[PDB]
Design a protein around this ligand. Structure first.
Ligand SMILES: Cc1cc2nc3c(=O)[nH]c(=O)nc-3n(C[C@H](O)[C@H](O)[C@H](O)COP(=O)(O)OP(=O)(O)OC[C@H]3O[C@@H](n4cnc5c(N)ncnc54)[C@H](O)[C@@H]3O)c2cc1C
Ligand code: NA
Length: 529
């Protein structure tokens, strides 16, 4: 028909492309990508992927580090599980063409050089200079493009998934495709499939400041919800503690790896502030550091803080942080000689769509893996470099489950075409622009790093106004990117806030002045549609 395949993968970053390869030798796969095929967080990951490779290190530490960085609510099977398959998955990646920095020199022979970021307690982060992402994305991309059974559809923005009991199909609720805005030809076309996989990324763009590409609008979280999936833990959004505070800093992240190799966190006056907050100093986990930086900006009334690796050999630095060095230089900053100004910005969505060990969601035929998901691995706070890591493990387990299921799968039926609504309004379009800004601004102030019930009230009320306001002014409006994206950001913002109002405690990334203490029995926050 319009478009047909066996497995439709929505998203083409680490989660999707990698899942796509595993499926390719025996399935017909179509990977969508809302912008160019490589635009996505993955392409921008710097510091690398955690796995366990050193004789000295052990799966045990990597788990325990994760259970700690997760502030008590990581789900254990989930952490071990995943702790227990990296390299293999990491190895798989390598067997695909990925080149991680080789050492040269244990004191006998060559290996994979390894960094560390906060919460780690052994060195096990494979990287490629200070720009792992480019190497992974670039490669999975190239493999998927040169494979007969995977069709890559760029500039294709999914709008919603097709659920059988919603289009009068009979049988249990299950996904059977998605309607997609074909950016280039400006229609919504229909894509049929036997399995749909959400690999869309996260949502940090709901926040005014973020380390993210402009794609990270939470679309798949929203799609899944509109389709019936429960979602969880969306109050746990991570604000990476060191993003560049420079006017031309579109949105840039200085890797945690910097701290991992000696970088320092300083006050505008030169002093190191972390030890006022946590023995773990520069390498404590992110909810705690981000909070400290936030605390100090407020107390001091300062625009910012600084990241300094000067104390270190120009050469070390330039060989281990090429990309960041090349690029702070264009902004007339010398990572080699000066402290860089940095601020905490929205970086990763710890929560998302509930899914089990094979990436399955609550709706048959619908999977989700990667940042768009919630597995239990990150509890209340991700540990650095577990993210790409989750993307890979779940692309595997999911490939396995699907593969086993495809042979018994129902035959690809015809579907209703999307009802292109078609009204226009040059001015109201602009308004859709005001609202996006509006949202991102109030979520920063009202569902940010420090929180209170009363601010969460303000946030929900404003989101409610936005949704009422949207049904009313943009239910008949012709599809477009901005409108698609705004419906999604607003939807996801609701789940975030509602999840945040449920937690009567301060844990991991959720900190609220009205409950500074810990409950003794916690768990995830769960919302169902
Ligand atoms: C600056 C930065 C650095 C990072 N560095 C690291 C690191 O070194 N190590 C690590 O583990 N993690 C790192 N992360 C976190 C980790 O990078 C991400 O969580 C991971 O890349 C998420 O990948 P993904 O496959 O799940 O989604 P993404 O790579 O973000 O891609 C999602 C894909 O979904 C597609 N998509 C989204 N919405 C739609 C839609 N509506 N319709 C159709 N397609 C859609 C997008 O087009 C995109 O192709 C970093 C993140 C950032 C932002
Ligand atoms: Na997630």
């Amino acid at each position: 028909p319009e478009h047909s395949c066996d497995v439709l993968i929505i998203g083409s970053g680490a989660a999707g492309l990698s899942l796509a390869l595993r499926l390719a030798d025996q399935h017909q796969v179509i990977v969508l990508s809302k912008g160019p095929v490589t635009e996505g967080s993955t392409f921008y990951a710097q510091g690398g992927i955690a796995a366990v490779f050193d004789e000295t290190d052990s799966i045990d530490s990597h788990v325990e580090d994760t259970l700690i960085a997760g502030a008590g609510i990581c789900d254990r099977h989930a952490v071990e599980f995943v702790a227990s398959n990296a390299r293999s998955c990491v190895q798989w990646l390598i067997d695909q063409g990925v080149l991680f920095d080789t050492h040269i020199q244990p004191n006998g022979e060559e290996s994979y050089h390894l960094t560390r970021e906060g919460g780690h307690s052994h060195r096990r982060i494979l990287h490629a200079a200070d720009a792992t992402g480019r190497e992974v994305e670039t490669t999975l991309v190239s493999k998927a493009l040169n494979h007969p059974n995977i069709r890559v559809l760029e500039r294709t923005n999914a709008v919603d998934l097709i659920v059988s009991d919603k289009i009068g199909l009979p049988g249990t609720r299950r996904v059977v495709g998605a309607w997609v805005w074909n950016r280039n030809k400006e229609t919504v076309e229909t894509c049929h499939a036997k399995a749909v996989v959400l690999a869309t990324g996260g949502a940090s763009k709901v926040y005014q400041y973020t380390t993210n590409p402009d794609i990270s609008s939470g679309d798949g979280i929203a799609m899944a919800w509109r389709a019936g999936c429960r979602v969880a833990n969306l109050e746990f959004n991570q604000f990476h503690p060191t993003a560049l505070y420079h006017p031309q800093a579109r949105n840039f992240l200085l890797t945690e790896a910097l701290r991992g190799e000696g970088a320092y966190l300083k006050r505008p006056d030169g002093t190191r502030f972390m030890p006022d907050f946590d023995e773990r100093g520069e390498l404590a986990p992110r909810d705690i550091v981000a909070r400290a930086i936030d605390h100090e900006m407020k107390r001091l009334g300062a625009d910012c803080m600084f990241l300094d690796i000067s104390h270190k050999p120009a050469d070390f630095i330039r060989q281990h942080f090429p990309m960041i060095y090349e690029k702070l230089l264009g902004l007339g900053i010398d990572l080699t000689q000066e402290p860089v100004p940095i601020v905490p910005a929205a970086h990763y969505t710890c929560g998302g769509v509930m899914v089990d060990d094979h990436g399955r969601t609550d709706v048959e035929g619908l999977y989700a893996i990667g940042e768009v998901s919630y597995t239990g691995l990150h509890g209340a706070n991700l540990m650095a470099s577990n993210s790409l890591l989750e993307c890979l493990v779940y692309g595997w387990s999911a490939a396995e489950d699907i593969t086993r299921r495809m042979p018994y799968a129902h035959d690809i039926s015809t579907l209703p075409p999307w009802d292109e609504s078609r009204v226009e309004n040059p001015d109201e379009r602009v308004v859709i622009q005001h609202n996006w800004h509006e949202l991102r601004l109030f979520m920063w102030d009202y569902v940010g790093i420090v929180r209170t019930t009363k601010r969460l009230e303000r946030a929900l009320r404003r989101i409610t106004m936005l949704q009422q306001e949207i049904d009313e002014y943009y239910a008949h409006f012709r599809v477009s990117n901005n409108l698609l994206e705004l419906r999604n950001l607003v939807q996801v913002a609701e789940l975030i806030v509602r999840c945040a109002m449920m937690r009567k405690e301060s844990r991991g990334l959720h900190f609220t002045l009205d409950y500074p203490e810990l409950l003794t029995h916690s768990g995830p926050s769960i919302l169902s549609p």
